[PDB]
Design an enzyme around this catalytic site. Structure first.
Site, PDB file in Angstrom:
ATOM      1  N   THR A 122      38.446 -13.588  -9.068  1.00 14.17           N
ATOM      2  CA  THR A 122      37.374 -12.588  -9.050  1.00 14.17           C
ATOM      3  C   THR A 122      37.926 -11.196  -9.354  1.00 14.17           C
ATOM      4  O   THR A 122      37.289 -10.407 -10.051  1.00 14.17           O
ATOM      5  CB  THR A 122      36.672 -12.552  -7.676  1.00 14.17           C
ATOM      6  OG1 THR A 122      36.383 -13.887  -7.249  1.00 14.17           O
ATOM      7  CG2 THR A 122      35.367 -11.753  -7.743  1.00 14.17           C
ATOM      8  N   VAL A 149      45.746 -11.650 -13.910  1.00 12.73           N
ATOM      9  CA  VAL A 149      47.072 -11.099 -13.605  1.00 12.73           C
ATOM     10  C   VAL A 149      48.127 -11.812 -14.449  1.00 12.73           C
ATOM     11  O   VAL A 149      48.121 -13.037 -14.556  1.00 12.73           O
ATOM     12  CB  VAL A 149      47.414 -11.214 -12.111  1.00 12.73           C
ATOM     13  CG1 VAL A 149      48.789 -10.623 -11.809  1.00 12.73           C
ATOM     14  CG2 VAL A 149      46.377 -10.478 -11.296  1.00 12.73           C
ATOM     15  N   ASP A 197      40.377  -8.437   4.025  1.00 14.01           N
ATOM     16  CA  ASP A 197      40.505  -9.809   3.542  1.00 14.01           C
ATOM     17  C   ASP A 197      41.949 -10.304   3.575  1.00 14.01           C
ATOM     18  O   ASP A 197      42.436 -10.894   2.612  1.00 14.01           O
ATOM     19  CB  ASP A 197      39.925  -9.964   2.129  1.00 14.01           C
ATOM     20  CG  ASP A 197      39.568 -11.420   1.797  1.00 14.01           C
ATOM     21  OD1 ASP A 197      39.589 -12.287   2.706  1.00 14.01           O
ATOM     22  OD2 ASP A 197      39.259 -11.697   0.620  1.00 14.01           O
TER      23      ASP A 197
HETATM   24  N1  6A6 Z   1      52.449 -11.382  -8.585  1.00 23.06           N
HETATM   25  C1  6A6 Z   1      52.265 -10.009  -8.413  1.00 23.06           C
HETATM   26  N2  6A6 Z   1      53.170  -9.068  -8.400  1.00 23.06           N
HETATM   27  N3  6A6 Z   1      52.567  -7.816  -8.193  1.00 23.06           N
HETATM   28  C2  6A6 Z   1      51.215  -7.981  -8.053  1.00 23.06           C
HETATM   29  C3  6A6 Z   1      50.119  -7.128  -7.825  1.00 23.06           C
HETATM   30  C4  6A6 Z   1      48.846  -7.640  -7.720  1.00 23.06           C
HETATM   31  C5  6A6 Z   1      48.620  -9.031  -7.844  1.00 23.06           C
HETATM   32  C6  6A6 Z   1      47.267  -9.637  -7.738  1.00 23.06           C
HETATM   33  O1  6A6 Z   1      46.389  -9.101  -8.394  1.00 23.06           O
HETATM   34  N4  6A6 Z   1      46.989 -10.748  -6.960  1.00 23.06           N
HETATM   35  C7  6A6 Z   1      45.608 -11.296  -6.906  1.00 23.06           C
HETATM   36  C8  6A6 Z   1      45.095 -11.303  -5.461  1.00 23.06           C
HETATM   37  C9  6A6 Z   1      46.165 -10.730  -4.533  1.00 23.06           C
HETATM   38  C10 6A6 Z   1      47.429 -11.539  -4.649  1.00 23.06           C
HETATM   39  C11 6A6 Z   1      47.983 -11.466  -6.086  1.00 23.06           C
HETATM   40  C12 6A6 Z   1      48.382 -12.867  -6.560  1.00 23.06           C
HETATM   41  C13 6A6 Z   1      48.942 -13.793  -5.666  1.00 23.06           C
HETATM   42  C14 6A6 Z   1      49.311 -15.065  -6.073  1.00 23.06           C
HETATM   43  C15 6A6 Z   1      49.146 -15.437  -7.396  1.00 23.06           C
HETATM   44  F1  6A6 Z   1      49.509 -16.675  -7.792  1.00 23.06           F
HETATM   45  C16 6A6 Z   1      48.605 -14.530  -8.301  1.00 23.06           C
HETATM   46  C17 6A6 Z   1      48.228 -13.255  -7.889  1.00 23.06           C
HETATM   47  C18 6A6 Z   1      49.703  -9.869  -8.095  1.00 23.06           C
HETATM   48  C19 6A6 Z   1      50.984  -9.365  -8.184  1.00 23.06           C
END
Ligand code: 6A6
Lengths: 268, 342
Positions: B32, B36, B147
Site C-alpha cells: 500500500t 520499494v 502501526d
Molecule cells: N529495505 C529498506 N531499507 N530502507 C528502507 C526504508 C523504507 C522501506 C519500506 O518502505 N518498507 C515498507 C514498509 C515498512 C518496512 C519496509 C520493508 C520491509 C520489508 C520488506 F521486505 C520491504 C520493505 C524499506 C527499506
C-alpha cells in the site's frame, strides 16, 4: 493539536536553513527593484499577505495553517523573482499545500478553486478586474515547483505558541492576549519571520501590547534571559509597520503597482 | 504562464531518479506504501546500497505530504533517515531515498521459528532497547507510529551501522488521528473502540514484539476472521493469554464504546485459569526474571497503567548481565539470508 516537533526548533530545518541573513535577502531583491521601488515592493508583500489571509478565512482554516502558507510564499519570493511564477497562482497553492500538512480535515480541489475565484471577486476587485484564470492543473503544477524550492521543508514554527506561554506566565491572558495576538498577525506583513526566531517575535509583540495598554511589565521582561537589543530591533520594525499602514492606501494603489511587476515571458 | 527561462533552467538542473540510480529488476518490497527497490548509484562516487521508495499514487497526497514533512525534521540513529526526495515532473511521482537495511524482525523471527532460538546472547535485549529508544524519540516529539509490528522494525546488515535497529513505516497520515477511519499487535482499547491513537497504543505493540522475540511466536496469534473496531476472536485470544481484567485492573473500561458488547459476548469465568505467568512459563520464560516483569508492565491492559518508553528504558533489565549492544548481532556472524528480488 499540532504538537508534532514542538520542542525541536533548535535542530529544525526552519532554524538551520530558513533563518536568512538580511543582506543576502536584500541582494536577491535587487533584480525585482529594477521594476519596483523598495516602497512598492513592501506594499506588494502586504497586499498578498492579506490575499492569503482572506483565502484562509474563506476555507475556515485555523490561523496557524494560514501563517505556514504565508511563510511558504515569502520563502519562494525570497529566492526567486515575482516574474518566475504568478503570485496570484502561488498564494492559493501555498494555502493548499499548508492545509495538507495537517491531518484534521482536508481541502478539496473544487473547494480551493471556488474559494480563490470567490475571494478575489468579492474582496479584491480593486486590484483584479478579470476573474481568477487558473484551473486545478495549474495549482498541481505550481505545488511541485514550490515544494522543490523549499527543499521539502514543510514544518514551520510561529510566534503564537510561545506568546500563549508568555501571557500565561504573566497572568495577563484576558488583558493582553487578544491585542498581542493581532500584533503577531501584523508581523506577517513584514520580513520578520525570515530573520528572527519565533519566540523573539512573540516577546516583541507582547512588549508593544503592554505599551499600548499602559501595563508596567519591565520587571517581568528583566527576569528573562534573552538578547534585548534583538527585541528592540523587532519592536522598531513593528512600529515602522504601523506608520507604513497609516500612509498606505492599498485600495487606491495596488492596481498600478501590480502593473509595474515584471511579467513572465512566454516560450519561443 | 510561468517564466520560460526559469522553467528550462530548473529542468536542466533537476536531478532525475533514473539518471542517478540503478534499480530496474531490484524490487524488494511492494504494498500500500507503494514500491520499494534496492538501488546503487550509477555515477560511482558512493559504493553502498540505498532503499528507493516510489510512493503509491500520484502528486502530493496528505499521506505523502505528512511523510515528507516529518521525515525532513526527524533525526535519530534508531529511526530510518530520509536522504533525498525526487519529484518526477512528467508522471507526477514522488520518490524517497533512504539508507538500505538488509534485515527486519519479521524475517529474523521466521528464520528462528523455521529452525528447531535467538543465538547471540543479549540480541533480544539489545533489539528491545533500540526499539524503545527510537519510539521514545518519536514520542518526545509528539509523533506516534500507529502501526508497529516486526515487519517495519528494520535491522542494518554488514556496513558501518551493523546490527542497528531502524524503525520504519510510521503511520504519518490518519484522518483526525482516528483508528475508526492482522490485529495481533493492536491494544485492547483499539478493539473496544478507542477514538484516537495514543503513545500507550505504540507501547502495547512493543510488548507484543518483545513476547515474540523471547518465544518466536506471536503472543496474540489469531485467525484472519471490517468497517468496525470490535474483533471478537482477537479479544478472545488476548483473554486466553492475559486473563479477563478485573474492575480494579481497568476502571475506565466502562467508558469504552464497545463495553456493553464485551459484556454481552464474554463471561469472565471462562478465563479463570488464564494469566501471562502461565503462558510464558509454557514457552520456557521464568516469571521471576527481569525480562518477564518488564514484559508484564508493557502488556498492561489498562492504557493509563501501561509503562511509558522512557520508564521502560530505565528498567533494571537493561542493567542486568548481558548489557545491550549497539550492534544487536554482537560482532557474531549473520546467518540470516539477504533480501530476494521480486
Ligand atoms: N529495505 C529498506 N531499507 N530502507 C528502507 C526504508 C523504507 C522501506 C519500506 O518502505 N518498507 C515498507 C514498509 C515498512 C518496512 C519496509 C520493508 C520491509 C520489508 C520488506 F521486505 C520491504 C520493505 C524499506 C527499506
Amino acid at each position: 493539536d499540532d504538537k508534532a516537533m514542538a520542542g525541536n526548533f533548535w535542530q529544525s530545518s526552519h532554524y538551520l536553513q530558513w533563518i536568512l541573513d538580511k543582506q543576502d535577502l536584500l541582494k536577491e531583491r535587487q533584480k525585482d527593484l529594477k521594476f519596483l521601488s523598495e516602497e512598492e515592493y513592501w506594499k506588494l508583500q502586504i497586499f498578498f499577505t492579506n490575499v492569503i489571509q482572506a483565502l484562509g478565512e474563506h476555507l475556515k482554516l485555523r490561523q496557524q495553517v494560514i501563517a505556514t502558507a504565508t511563510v511558504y510564499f515569502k520563502r519562494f519570493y525570497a529566492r526567486y523573482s515575482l516574474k518566475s511564477i504568478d503570485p496570484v497562482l502561488m498564494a492559493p497553492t501555498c494555502v493548499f499545500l499548508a492545509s495538507k500538512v495537517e491531518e484534521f480535515g482536508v481541502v478539496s480541489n473544487t473547494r480551493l478553486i471556488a474559494a480563490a475565484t470567490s475571494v478575489l471577486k468579492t474582496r479584491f476587485s480593486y486590484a483584479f478586474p478579470k476573474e481568477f484564470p487558473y484551473r486545478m492543473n495549474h495549482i498541481l503544477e505550481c505545488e511541485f515547483y514550490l515544494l522543490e524550492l523549499m527543499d521539502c521543508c514543510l514544518i514551520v514554527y510561529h510566534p503564537y505558541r510561545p506568546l500563549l506561554q508568555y501571557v500565561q506566565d504573566m497572568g495577563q491572558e484576558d488583558m493582553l492576549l487578544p491585542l498581542a495576538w493581532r500584533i503577531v498577525n501584523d508581523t506577517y506583513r513584514t520580513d520578520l519571520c525570515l530573520l528572527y526566531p519565533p519566540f523573539m517575535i512573540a516577546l516583541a509583540c507582547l512588549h508593544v501590547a503592554c505599551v499600548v495598554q499602559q501595563k508596567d511589565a519591565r520587571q517581568w521582561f528583566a527576569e528573562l534571559s534573552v538578547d534585548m537589543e534583538k527585541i528592540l530591533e523587532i519592536i522598531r520594525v513593528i512600529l515602522k509597520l504601523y506608520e507604513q499602514w497609516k500612509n498606505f492606501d492599498e485600495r487606491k494603489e495596488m492596481a498600478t503597482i501590480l502593473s509595474k511587476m515584471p511579467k513572465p515571458k512566454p516560450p519561443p | 504562464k510561468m517564466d520560460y527561462d526559469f522553467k528550462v533552467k530548473l529542468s536542466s538542473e533537476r536531478e532525475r531518479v533514473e539518471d542517478l540510480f540503478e534499480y530496474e529488476g531490484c524490487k524488494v518490497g511492494r504494498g500500500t506504501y507503494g514500491h520499494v527497490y534496492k538501488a546503487k548509484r550509477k555515477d560511482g562516487k558512493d559504493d553502498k546500497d540505498y532503499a528507493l521508495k516510489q510512493i503509491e499514487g500520484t502528486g502530493i497526497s496528505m499521506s505523502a505530504c505528512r511523510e515528507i514533512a516529518l521525515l525532513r525534521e526527524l533525526k535519530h540513529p534508531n529511526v530510518i533517515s530520509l536522504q533525498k526526495v525526487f519529484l518526477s515532473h512528467a508522471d507526477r511521482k514522488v520518490w524517497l531515498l533512504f539508507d538500505y537495511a538488509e534485515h527486519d524482525l519479521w524475517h529474523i523471527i521466521k528464520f528462528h521459528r523455521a529452525s528447531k532460538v535467538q543465538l547471540p546472547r543479549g540480541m533480544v535485549k539489545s533489539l528491545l532497547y533500540q526499539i524503545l529508544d527510537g519510539i521514545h524519540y518519536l514520542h518526545a516529539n509528539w509523533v506516534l507510529h500507529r502501526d508497529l509490528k516486526p515487519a517495519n522494525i528494520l535491522v542494518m546488515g554488514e556496513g558501518p551501522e551493523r546490527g542497528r535497529v531502524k524503525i520504519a513505516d510510521m503511520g504519518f497520515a490518519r484522518l483526525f488521528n482516528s483508528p475508526l477511519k492482522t490485529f495481533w499487535y493492536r491494544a485492547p482499547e483499539l478493539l473496544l473502540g478507542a477514538r484516537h491513537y495514543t503513545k500507550a497504543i505504540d507501547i502495547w505493540a512493543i510488548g507484543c514484539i518483545f513476547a515474540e522475540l523471547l518465544t518466536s511466536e506471536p503472543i496474540f496469534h489469531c485467525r484472519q476472521e471490517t468497517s468496525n473496531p470490535y474483533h471478537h476472536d482477537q479479544l478472545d485470544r488476548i483473554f486466553n493469554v492475559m486473563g479477563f481484567p478485573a474492575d480494579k485492573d481497568w476502571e475506565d473500561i466502562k467508558k469504552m464504546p464497545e463495553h456493553s458488547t464485551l459484556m454481552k459476548d464474554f463471561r469472565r469465568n471462562t478465563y479463570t485459569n488464564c494469566s501471562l505467568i502461565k503462558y510464558m512459563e509454557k514457552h520456557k520464560v521464568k516469571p521471576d526474571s527481569k525480562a518477564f516483569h518488564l514484559l508484564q508492565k508493557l502488556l498492561t491492559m489498562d492504557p493509563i497503567k501501561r509503562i511509558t518508553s522512557e520508564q521502560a528504558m530505565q528498567d533494571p533489565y537493561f542493567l542486568e548481565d548481558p548489557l545491550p549492544t549497539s550492534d544487536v548481532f554482537a560482532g557474531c556472524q549473520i546467518p540470516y539470508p539477504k533480501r530476494e528480488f521480486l
